[PDB]
């Protein structure tokens, strides 16, 4: 795999909702919840996941910011 391929899918859910360069709140759920089940070794609530990912979407999370969760699959 390559960061292309972390983008594409990604790009996958945004694509949804909020523009395909933004991952809505609602939407990162769908997304992780399909991709990364058991690669996010570990959980917590939507809210505080989400915000702690959201450096700054204050709306949606971006492929930017989503990097944190691409950093934190191999944690």
């Known amino acids: ?4 391929e972390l983008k594409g899918i990604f790009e996958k859910y945004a694509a949804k909702e909020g523009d395909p360069n933004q991952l809505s709140k609602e939407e990162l759920k769908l997304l992780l919840q399909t991709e990364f089940p058991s690669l996010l070794k570990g959980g917590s609530t939507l809210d505080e996941l989400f915000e702690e ?4 979407g204050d709306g949606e999370v971006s492929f930017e910011e989503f990097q944190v969760l691409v950093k934190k699959i191999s944690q």
Do not use: A
Not at 1 to 4: A, H, L, V
Not at 53 to 56: S, V
């Open 1 to 4: 795999k390559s960061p292309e």
């Open 53 to 56: 990912l959201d450096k700054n």
